[PDB]
Design a protein around this ligand. Structure first.
Ligand code: MG
Ligand code: MG
Ligand code: MG
Ligand code: MG
Ligand code: MG
Ligand code: MG
Ligand code: MG
Ligand code: MG
Ligand code: MG
Lengths: 442, 442
């Protein structure tokens, strides 16, 4: 963290001596800790490589932000020494802000590369496309080892990775892998179609990130081959590239465990007006059904004017019944995602749960009713116990069987938030404290 | 999914023709879909490799489970053709169940390997140790390229990975990397200390998984070098190995967003008794403070017998106030984790939020109070609006400033669940509907 010295004079000499011995990340680490001036000045000095990298690892918006400021003499320079896949996605960041700057800034790009990027924008950001890089290593089945090792002796600094060589026939279709770990021990005269592997795993141009992701986690890979409608090899996907697709779809899920329902969402980047518009979309439909909570507490007013001396027992009661429905749904929901359990594993849970439900209800009842007495209302004390428990159970069995419900209909169970619960757990959670009090007084 | 044929006869011939052409994973996929008999019989047929693999990818308990049943003539067989790191962790799985079987089963292990694993158990399963594998590639600074490429021509099938060669001096200390991608283009006569990289990133033997994980996501690596107290290179960590550490610490986090507070937790594996003991640890402390919710609704009974005609407005009211505190805490909590925001970023949120809070409260008030009239209680209609709003705000500002609170004291913010909120959001959320009704009647 000494860089903050060879930069205060705004010279040239003492600065360049640093922007060559420090790793891109160190910078990224102290980047959001910089000033609108230093940054605007550093992203125009580090070498072609470093500058490019440090950019691809910036918020999509923070990227296009410095693609409108940075001097045009460096644009046609960075865009090149910048990995293609990282570009494609990054280049798009701009489009969400300036549909013109795109068409224009795009020209600064060499037509030899542009035509390639003019194909990675046609693929969604969900499917393989928006992740696959064309800079791969592809050989032919009718070649030698001494030949492939010599083919990589060159064109090695122009391919995302030469550790996994793919094989394709004349028509361009894939038909086998070829670990370099093998090209090193094999005999220099051996054919390629004899050390290769015909049983190759792949991913279609259109496969949800999550899906693609999973494969590289089970099959313990690091490089997945992307194919097209017919079967031609048109791109590869790196692991450090998908290692993010996780934290992303991971934070997208932790998010939908609240109201917050917006695709890519960061925090430091979003004015109060922004959070508001989204957060309040949900917070509202939620208090539409919750509204019915108080409307029903009305229909049963006749007998309620009798439950006059009590009813103070709807907070602790309707809440604990909610907390339950949560743990339940939480646990099952993530499960459905971790490929643990399934659409066919619902019976098995329904049951398994009934046990935990009535199991808890009892431990809890002893606690609530133990004080529902000591508090000062020994009168009608069954309404409390019979309900808390008759509910904790009825609740845990709701949040537990709901997530499945969605999947049976095709919908990210993550949608079944905690509040969607702490609400429907108030709806039904009340009707019980009513019949368990009405037909407990006549 | 044809395997279910060459297995019904319980023969020998037609079965082994399958357990040779089927990938380990296909099996794992249909493993939890098998019977206590087929499994117990298949894990004794597949070749040394496949059988070993399929085991390392099984719940820690489901592992040690089949290490007490499987025939002893296969144990000293699997435990060998089984990667060391995966063993270490796996062999421990047994220890949490049988402190004897361990000491014993351990014996079937070749002393040459045993002494190696008798060192991977002294490292926590949180720290690097429980993840680092000793089967790495380490060379010396004073060697050539044609020499390292020739050193890998052999001992290639006994190293976790030879794609990233590490350099160390005579005393065994690390001092540079060496990408194979380089050993391929460099001149066969070039020394090692001239194409290597002195600026190497590393991880100490004791570094929380998450921490070690992060590195391999930023520096876009795939192989991290593990060092010891002094600085000697004693192990490496694979990406596909850490790619899990994520989904793990990822699901540990989504879990702590409820009561569910237990380290490694799977679902299919946990008798209602299991879930119960943990889930109910939290659901209890939670309804200890929630208990206070109804005890306070008492202290204000004198004025409450007055609020007879009403008070049915505590469900929709105290709930929406809770839903708010959730979105808040959820968003901020995950942020603290995504390295977005910080312990210094508390002021900027407190403010940013005041806006969103009072912003929402109003949108919401319009909704609640719009019906608090049309419902049939136009009388004292301010108690509803003034509170809902005076609360939505005071709630969102709680769940928003709570996660930081813990971090200021060193505690995984994830602990601040949603229900921990939907409860404290009931405590304070009430006291308001009281002063906003008591000093609104005199
Ligand atoms: Mg894996
Ligand atoms: Mg990439
Ligand atoms: Mg998605
Ligand atoms: Mg999801
Ligand atoms: Mg509640
Ligand atoms: Mg930890
Ligand atoms: Mg990364
Ligand atoms: Mg490993
Ligand atoms: Mg965590």
């Amino acid at each position: 963290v000494s860089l903050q010295e060879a930069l205060q004079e705004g010279d040239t000499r003492a600065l360049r001596e640093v922007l060559e011995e420090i790793h891109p990340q160190d910078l990224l680490a102290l980047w959001d800790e910089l000033k609108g001036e230093h940054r605007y000045v550093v992203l125009t000095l580090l070498p072609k490589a470093k500058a490019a990298e440090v950019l691809s690892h910036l918020s999509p918006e923070e990227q296009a932000e410095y693609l409108k400021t940075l001097p045009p003499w460096r644009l046609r320079e960075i865009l090149e020494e910048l990995s293609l896949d990282d570009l494609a996605d990054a280049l798009q960041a701009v489009r969400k802000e300036d549909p013109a700057y795109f068409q224009r800034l795009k020209d600064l790009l060499d037509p030899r590369t542009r035509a390639e990027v003019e194909a990675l924008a046609r693929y969604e950001e969900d499917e393989a496309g928006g992740l696959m890089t064309p800079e791969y290593v592809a050989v032919r089945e009718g070649m030698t080892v001494e030949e492939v090792l010599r083919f990589l002796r060159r064109a090695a600094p122009d391919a995302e990775t030469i550790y996994y060589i793919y094989v394709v026939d004349e028509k361009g279709r894939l038909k086998g892998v070829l670990s370099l770990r093998d090209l090193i021990v094999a005999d220099p005269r051996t054919r390629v179609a004899e050390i290769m592997n015909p049983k190759v795993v792949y991913v279609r141009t259109d496969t949800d990130q999550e899906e693609v992701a999973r494969l590289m986690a089970d099959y313990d890979f690091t490089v997945l081959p992307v194919v097209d409608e017919e079967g031609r090899l048109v791109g590869i996907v790196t692991v450090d590239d998908v290692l993010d697709v996780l934290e992303a779809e991971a934070t997208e899920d932790i998010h939908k465990l609240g109201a917050v329902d917006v695709p890519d969402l960061v925090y430091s980047e979003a004015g109060p007006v922004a959070l508001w518009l989204a957060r309040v979309r949900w917070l509202v439909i939620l208090i539409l059904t919750g509204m019915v909570t108080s409307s029903i507490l009305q229909g049963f007013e006749s007998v309620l004017e009798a439950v006059t001396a009590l009813a103070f027992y709807v907070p602790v009661l309707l809440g604990t019944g909610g907390n339950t429905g949560n743990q339940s749904a939480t646990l099952i929901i993530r499960a459905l995602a971790t490929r643990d359990l399934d659409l066919r594993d619902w019976r098995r849970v329904f049951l398994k749960e009934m046990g935990v439900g009535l199991l808890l209800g009892l431990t809890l009842s002893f606690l609530l009713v133990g004080k529902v007495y000591w508090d000062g209302h020994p009168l009608l004390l069954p309404v409390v116990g019979v309900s808390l428990v008759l509910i904790v159970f009825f609740a845990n069995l709701v949040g537990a069987m709901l997530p499945f419900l969605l999947r049976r209909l095709g919908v990210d169970p993550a949608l079944v938030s905690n509040p969607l619960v702490a609400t429907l757990s108030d709806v039904t959670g009340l009707l019980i404290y009513l019949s368990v009090a009405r037909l407990l007084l006549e």
